[PDB]
Amino acid sequence: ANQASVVANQLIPINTALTLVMMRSEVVTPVGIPAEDIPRLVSMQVNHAVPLGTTLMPDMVKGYAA
């Protein structure tokens, strides 16, 4: 409970480097990448377009390991 995840603040297109305006922190369920990791995610890539409001899960980010 009460753990925050990275949520897509805009549609994040494929093969596009993640920027800070693309990511917000929100308490959603299920839990995705912890909000704490929003600096680590900067400049990484998604392997599929993420719609607005989707929680970013580990598998969506190319090269992500926690």
Name the residue range of residue 17's domain. 1-66
Sign of the alpha-carbon torsion through 24, 25, 27, 32: positive
Query: Where do we find the tokens 């607005």?
Result: 52
User: Which method resolved this structure?
Assistant: X-ray
52: left (phi over 0), alpha (psi -120 to 50) or beta: beta
Residues 58 and 6: their CA atoms lie apart, in Å, by 10
Beta-bridged to residue 17, according to DSSP, are 45
Within 1-66, where are the H helices? 38-41
How many structural domains does the chain have?
A: 1
The CATH number given to whatever domain includes residue 23 is 3.90.1210.10
